[PDB]
Design a protein around this ligand. Structure first.
Ligand SMILES: Cc1cc2nc3c(=O)[nH]c(=O)nc-3n(C[C@H](O)[C@H](O)[C@H](O)COP(=O)(O)OP(=O)(O)OC[C@H]3O[C@@H](n4cnc5c(N)ncnc54)[C@H](O)[C@@H]3O)c2cc1C
Ligand SMILES: Cc1cc2nc3c(=O)[nH]c(=O)nc-3n(C[C@H](O)[C@H](O)[C@H](O)COP(=O)(O)OP(=O)(O)OC[C@H]3O[C@@H](n4cnc5c(N)ncnc54)[C@H](O)[C@@H]3O)c2cc1C
Ligand SMILES: OCc1c[nH]c2ccccc12
Ligand SMILES: OCc1c[nH]c2ccccc12
Ligand SMILES: [K+]
Ligand SMILES: [K+]
Ligand SMILES: [K+]
Ligand SMILES: [K+]
Lengths: 587, 587
């Protein structure tokens, strides 16, 4: 399918040069395009095994089999003499800008995936527009360019986690000889939020600058795809217009869910509001048991808050439940309270938020446990963290023919194509994929290369590592133990595990058998590592490197033959020997 | 060579049972041995591909081809009826203890390797003695069981590093909203040392307990091997005696070097003294440029010391020199001074150490630079960190025939055997091997299994990862860039690199382009990762996991197809794209 790849590549690339590495006439064209600041893809036919067949197949477009050959939006433009003559006639600029559509690419959504896709496409000469609009929360919260992670997700959340971890650092410093008295040190919410928000603002501004500098058109407008190639945009003045694009990337992400109960929208908040909140939440109820819920509860408690988590059923559904239980046990032993088997029925307002002060209001939460008994307690802040959902019917006229699943997410092939041939979807709205910022970035960058640089590489969505930034962090890569046993049977699963104590916790008088790690392995496949799990400090740094080895098919023997780095937490993965089957305690 | 393996296994195992998994008569013997608390190796012939050939070859020792078959020190003891009859006659205990020698194994040296080897051997029924003696430093410093890492190496050093890192944690906490004022907080050396030493003491005691509980004989005595099977021991009362052992493991480690200059031994100290020093060093000169020198200088400076490092030529000789320079640049920008191209000539004493106080003395250091100009400056403490050396002529009568190299280290085959067939060497004294605690532990455990459990697996000494715990930590696995270019040529090496900023450093107002990572790759071998290098926080946790992937032969494509964990430092390894060849700035 060499000819098939060539046709697809020529038809979708915006500006593409077919070249050879050792070709003085190709260098002449490259240098001209560089001086003219015309961005383009380049295919060096000498570095392709099928380069000779591609060179001959080009004649079916251009009539010639020589290099260089320049194409614009599927049209052969010329050889070296022709391109250079156009340039000398000041005609090349017009030719490279000729298009049926306003843009080669319209990205709807300026978050993790969309920005990554748009920037990468422009690198290859695609005339690109990135649309971003932030629908305000119920209380009016909005923010700048960059998406969920940047503004109300990974970035602020990990920063506030770090604020929380520094609590323990202050306690520990005494034991290591520093003269501070932790009991006399307090935390100021407003100071922290100001610092977090100043960094977010530098990211908002940096994205706008980068797009300008990369010749990407940024529109702060809500986009609606009204036909395969037409995007209706509404700007902040409510002015409505239509732009057209050849390729469309949907990258609109999700927003928090609210339960359908009285008072939820009016009196509660979500993570969208928390990270810029202009008052300390105070006594807080977090409703939900997702990683978002536990991460937020964890740092609120470490910053001195009185924190309760209301749990409908289990913690961290979809994660290894042994690990989820250890995560919650640690939180409960460090000052987080849990209302178990419990759901809210209504939020009543007892005091309105005092805008002229850094004070929360006061709320009455009524709920009930699964056995029917009543929950009733006052809180100053109620945070809903019960999941996130796409928002697409506000972005997709059903007329267009982009298929959604029962959850409202876009149904895509393994190259991110929707059911409309020129429309693609990336990030959290792509059904069935891990909903993680680096996934969206990789999917968007790799898709842009396929569209505009003739690349073929797909995103690999398997064994994507995670880290939950709870007070004691939880990193994982691969299968949970229970999923492994379900798939292969208990007799084919061997689990090696161990507690451990960070050296840093020894002089600090922290707990000896709370950190924990395990390898879930498949006996019949040479003890293949199906899943790695670690509860401990710096769990994301620990886990990341092993995700490469698991991607490569690491076995238990691969871990064993590797030598540890001492003293680290991570080295314990290289000497695991206690199996769950053996019954020997992991302590 | 199945018969050859069997002969070797039978001759060297102390107590070994040849069995099958599904064998009720073997279970009868196993249960008896368990009740009698007779430890032994077990070879399940059904789990060996050549099990049928081994079962037949056993008859050449025992006259029978059935299982179970029990051997003690090369002697066939009996089948199930015979072993059970011995047990019922209360004769089995005597038979299993019969030996030509006092011990199956004498370990000379109770450090990382030796303790690991001795404990593992005893698991298989080897009657084991572990000898440990700590020759005092020039000023009289000594310590307990456990070796260099435990007492005067990795453990105390990383603990004091952590004390130093907490300095930055206190600074950072303010920016994250905590009310402390770092400028009013000071550090107390004695409090820290007391905490470090209390942990070390728990390790000393724990090793003694473990050896007792594992039936290993601990002798706090200096051992000298006077013939292949005889060890002369001198206890702390100077009483001299001789014990005999079948196998001997030399695991005696190294001690710091002193330069041959007036005043060095009398007035300087080394790392052996630093970690229990009963006074703060004060204004300190560290002579040397090893990882030990830089690690100690780094935490002394972070704990408020006035610190100078005297460097003969380069930093971290043998490490990637681009990385070593970045390590030193960071130290110099954070309050460590460097006396470059400089060597000491003599240390003169100006004030004697005041034992009735926590005060150092005062010293005059005279030296000279390579151009002949004079160095002369006063310091309160001078720490020599100019390398470590073995001490074996005090442990090895040349009579015995154990070959040493020009540096005094033991010349070993790839199974740790010396030139004397029953004598092995592990850890730092084994010539040519990485001198690291986890290496010594793995070598010792794996050797014990080969000696006493019929194992065949060797220690793999290639691509052993390291981490230097300087104030900004430096982790590496594999080749330095310069070694890669020397081995394969510059045109075959591609280096991908990037600066990065820990998210934790953003709100804290730390430096934007100081952390750095690179992958040194081989073009002609599918961009194989020859070396990984990272300068940043938690560098050991970052690096460890990748050492498995490198062990498995990771390529650049393996890193690229892996998805990052966000937000971490380590994830930057999964998106590297800037090559050194390209000339594009890594910032
Ligand atoms: C509290 C929280 C914490 C998280 N922590 C982590 C973590 O630690 N590690 C990790 O990997 N992931 C984390 N995530 C998930 C991560 O943020 C998402 O996976 C990532 O942001 C998804 O990127 P995206 O491009 O799909 O969508 P988004 O980043 O959400 O961007 C979509 C953009 O498009 C906008 N938009 C929507 N509709 C339109 C429209 N019609 N027109 C124009 N613009 C529109 C949206 O307002 C938004 O700005 C967290 C999420 C949350 C809520
Ligand atoms: C300051 C310093 C910091 C270090 N930091 C790290 C780090 O961060 N990570 C890492 O991996 N490695 C580190 N190391 C190296 C590590 O400590 C050594 O590689 C490890 O301890 C070697 O183990 P070993 O068994 O060979 O010898 P040792 O641990 O030194 O034990 C040998 C024992 O045998 C004793 N002995 C000597 N002669 C006799 C005799 N005749 N009879 C009886 N006993 C005898 C010795 O006194 C000693 O107790 C560090 C070393 C130093 C000095
Ligand atoms: O106590 C904390 C905790 C551990 N496991 C849990 C499961 C559901 C709700 C709370 C917990
Ligand atoms: O300034 C610190 C430093 C960076 N590189 C070095 C090499 C030799 C001696 C000191 C340094
Ligand atoms: K990515
Ligand atoms: K190992
Ligand atoms: K080891
Ligand atoms: K990647």
């Amino acid at each position: 399918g060499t000819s098939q790849w060539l046709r697809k590549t020529v038809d979708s690339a915006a500006v593409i040069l077919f070249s050879k590495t050792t070709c003085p006439y190709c260098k002449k064209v490259k240098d001209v395009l560089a001086e003219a600041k015309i961005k383009h893809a380049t295919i060096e036919l000498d570095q392709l095994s099928n380069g000779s067949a591609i060179q001959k197949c080009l004649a079916s477009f251009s009539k010639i089999e020589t290099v260089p050959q320049m194409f614009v939006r599927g049209k052969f433009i010329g050889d070296s003499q022709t391109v250079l003559k156009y340039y000398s006639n000041d005609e090349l600029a017009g030719i490279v800008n000729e298009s049926k559509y306003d843009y080669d690419l319209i990205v709807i959504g300026g978050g993790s995936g969309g920005l990554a896709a748009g920037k990468e496409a422009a690198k290859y000469g695609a005339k690109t527009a990135v649309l971003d609009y932030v629908e305000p929360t119920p209380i009016g919260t909005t923010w700048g360019l960059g998406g969920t992670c940047v503004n109300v997700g990974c970035i602020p959340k990990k920063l506030m986690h770090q604020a929380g971890l520094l609590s323990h650092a202050l306690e520990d410093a005494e034991h290591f000889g520093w003269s501070l008295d932790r009991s006399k040190i307090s935390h100021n919410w407003s100071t922290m939020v100001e610092g977090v928000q100043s960094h977010i603002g530098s990211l908002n501004w940096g994205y706008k600058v980068a797009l300008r500098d990369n010749q990407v058109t940024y529109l702060n407008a809500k986009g609606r795809l009204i036909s395969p190639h037409e995007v209706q945009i509404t700007d902040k003045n409510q002015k409505v217009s239509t732009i057209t694009g050849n390729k469309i990337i949907l990258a609109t992400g999700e927003r928090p869910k609210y339960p359908e109960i009285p008072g939820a929208v009016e009196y509660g908040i979500t993570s969208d509001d928390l990270f810029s909140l202009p008052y300390f939440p105070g006594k807080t109820l977090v409703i939900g048991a997702s990683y978002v819920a536990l991460e937020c509860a964890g740092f609120l408690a470490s910053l001195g808050g009185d924190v309760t988590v209301m749990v409908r059923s289990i913690l961290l559904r979809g994660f290894d439940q042994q690990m989820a239980e250890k995560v919650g046990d640690y939180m409960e032993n460090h000052g987080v309270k849990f209302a178990k088997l419990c759901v809210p029925d209504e939020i009543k307002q007892l005091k309105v938020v005092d805008t002229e002060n850094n004070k929360p209001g006061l709320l009455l939460v009524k709920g009930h446990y699964t056995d029917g008994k009543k929950f009733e307690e006052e809180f100053e802040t109620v945070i809903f963290a019960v999941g996130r959902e796409p928002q697409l019917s506000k972005v997709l006229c059903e007329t267009v023919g982009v298929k959604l699943d029962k959850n409202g997410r876009v149904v895509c092939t393994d190259d991110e194509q929707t059911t409309v041939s020129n429309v693609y979807a990336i990030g959290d709205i792509n059904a069935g994929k891990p909903q993680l910022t680096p996934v969206a970035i990789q999917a968007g960058r790799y898709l842009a290369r396929r569209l505009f640089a003739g690349a073929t590489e797909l995103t690999d969505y398997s064994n994507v590592a995670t880290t939950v930034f709870t007070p004691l962090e939880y990193g994982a890569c691969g299968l949970s133990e229970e999923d492994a046993i379900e798939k292969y049977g208990d007799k084919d699963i061997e689990v090696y595990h161990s507690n451990f104590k960070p050296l840093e916790w020894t002089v600090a008088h922290r707990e000896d058998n709370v950190c924990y790690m395990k390898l879930v392995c498949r006996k019949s496949d040479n003890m293949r590592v199906l899943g790695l799990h670690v509860l401990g400090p710096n769990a994301g740094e620990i886990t990341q490197g092993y995700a490469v080895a698991i991607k490569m098919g690491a076995t238990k023997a691969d871990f064993d033959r590797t030598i540890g780095i001492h003293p680290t937490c991570s080295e314990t993965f290289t000497t695991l020997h206690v199996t769950k089957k053996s019954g020997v305690s992991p302590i």
